[PDB]
Amino acid sequence: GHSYEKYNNWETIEAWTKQVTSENPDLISRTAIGTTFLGNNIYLLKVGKPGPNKPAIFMDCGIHAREWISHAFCQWFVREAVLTYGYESHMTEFLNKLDFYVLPVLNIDGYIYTWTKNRMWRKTRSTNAGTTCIGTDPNRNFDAGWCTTGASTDPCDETYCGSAAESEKETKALADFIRNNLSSIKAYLSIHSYSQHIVYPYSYDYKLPENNAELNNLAKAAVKELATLYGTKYTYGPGATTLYLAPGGGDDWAYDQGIKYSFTFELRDKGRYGFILPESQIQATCEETMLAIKYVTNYVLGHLY
Ligand SMILES: NCCCC[C@H](NC(=O)N[C@H](CC1CCCCC1)C(=O)N[C@H]1C[C@H]2CC[C@@H]1C2)C(=O)O
Ligand SMILES: [Zn+2]
Ligand SMILES: [Zn+2]
Ligand SMILES: [Zn+2]
């Protein structure tokens, strides 16, 4: 049984994507955009009222395996879209004027592995020449300052950059889709955990984006919004300046393709529970996070380009 208030295994998520599609065929369609290293189909949900020449927002969750609240947040947002379309002003406006490409789990092989073998797995589950060490960090795998400081050339390491930018079938699939749909995609959002942080470019070097100011004011305002449900406290900023150098990120790759609004959400908590966030925090984290998401999507709508 699927539940939006529990963490579901991959078999549960896969069946849910087939089902939420067939049950809401006018709001949602589903493609496979690639296959994983282990041959799993990477489903993508095109969410929105079918209409011609629509701009789009891309979102991904599940890039990293152990960050379970993130996978639960993609399903939640799809949940909000289906339940509140026709019932809430803003959501409704958003689905008529925009399509949402929601990739609920990028790193499907890593996720299965956190359910079967190791709860604290992050990377993919591809093999590496010369070692029996497994996995590439997808969010060091993108062609954007690829494999510079903050990424590791060691395969045994948790930030390993891969053998080439886009070496992971999963990264390649997600970058191929986005190049294939570049002229419609107006924003890029990537959901992660933990640390209650909203980051924007750049993470691959210490530099600030052309619209730093606008992204500063926009991150300030979504943190502020998010903070109005339960008063949860989020910090924000440019990635290199806020967290650490983290090159080969999808957020930077997308921005350098000309997707001007690009954000990484690092959800609950600050460390009490970490990656192992009680299922009893799903509902609240997603609800407070949805307010930040819609807040960004309403900005974008007002600032098309
Ligand atoms: N693309 C721009 C933003 C990228 C930032 C993103 N952050 C991210 O993954 N953070 C988590 C979450 C926790 C980890 C404990 C401290 C609090 C946060 C994590 O597991 N990071 C790993 C990276 C190294 C530093 C810690 C490990 C090794 C990333 O590293 O790709
Ligand atoms: Zn992450
Ligand atoms: Zn809700
Ligand atoms: Zn304006």
Q: What HEC string does the chain produce?
A: CCCCCCCCCHHHHHHHHHHHHHHCCCCEEEEEEEECCCCCEEEEEEECCCCCCCCEEEEECCCCCCCHHHHHHHHHHHHHHHHHCCCCHHHHHHHHHCEEEEECCCCHHHHHHHHHCCCCCCCCCCCCCCCCCCCCCHHHCCCCCCCCECEECCCCCCCECCCCCCCCHHHHHHHHHHHHCCCCEEEEEEEEECCCEEEECCCCCCCCCCCHHHHHHHHHHHHHHHCCCCCCCCEEEEHHHHCCCCCCCHHHHHHHCCCCEEEEEEECCCCCCCCCCCHHHHHHHHHHHHHHHHHHHHHHHHCCC
CATH superfamily of 1-305: Zn peptidases (3.40.630.10)
In this structure, which amino acid lies at residue 75?
Q
Which residues, in sequence order, are CB contacts of 2 under 8 Å at separation 6+?
Answer: 8, 12, 13, 15, 16, 19
Q: Which of 272, 274, 247, 252 is nearest to 264 (CA)?
A: 252
User: What does the alpha-carbon distance between residue 50 and residue 152 come to, in Å, rounded to a whole number?
Assistant: 43
Q: Which of 268, 238, 301, 305 is nearest to 73 (CA)?
A: 268
Distances in whole angstroms, Cα of residue 297 to Cα of each of 36, 179, 210, 268: 29, 21, 20, 21
User: What does the alpha-carbon distance between residue 140 and residue 109 come to, in Å, rounded to a whole number?
Assistant: 17
Would you say the CB of residue 251 lies under 6 angstroms from ligand 1? yes
User: What does the alpha-carbon distance between residue 53 and residue 251 come to, in Å, rounded to a whole number?
Assistant: 25
230 in a labelled binding site: no
Which residues, in sequence order, are CB contacts of 63 under 8 Å at separation 6+?
Answer: 70, 106, 107, 138, 139, 190, 192, 250
Would you say the CB of residue 107 lies under 6 angstroms from ligand 1? no
Would you say the CB of residue 239 lies under 6 angstroms from ligand 1? yes
After which residues does the chain break, using C–N > 2.5 Å? none
The residues with which 187 forms a beta bridge, in sequence order, are 57, 261
Q: Which of 127, 176, 145, 136 is nearest to 248 (CA)?
A: 145
The resolution, in Å, is: 2.0
In this structure, which amino acid lies at residue 250?
G
Would you say the CB of residue 243 lies under 6 angstroms from ligand 1? yes
Place of tokens 């004011």: 217
Cα 2 to ligand 3 centre (Å): 17
Cα 194 to ligand 1 centre (Å): 8
Give the count of beta carbons closer than 10 Å to the beta carbon of residue 167: 15
Which atom of ligand 1 has the smallest separation from the CA of 246?
Answer: 4
In this structure, which amino acid lies at residue 292?
A
139 in a labelled binding site: yes
User: What does the alpha-carbon distance between residue 195 and residue 128 come to, in Å, rounded to a whole number?
Assistant: 30
Sheet holding 185-193: strands in order across? Answer: 28-35, 41-47, 99-103, 56-60, 185-193, 261-267, 197-200, 235-238
Burial of 201 (C-beta count, 10 Å sphere; 0-12/13-18/19+): buried
Q: Whose CA is nearest to atom 31 of ligand 1?
A: 139
Q: Which of 66, 65, 48 is nearest to 57 (CA)?
A: 48
Q: Which residues are catalytic?
A: 266
Asked whether 174 and 108 are in contact (CB, 8 A), the reply is: no
Asked whether 44 and 177 are in contact (CB, 8 A), the reply is: yes
Which atom of ligand 1 has the smallest separation from the CA of 250?
Answer: 1
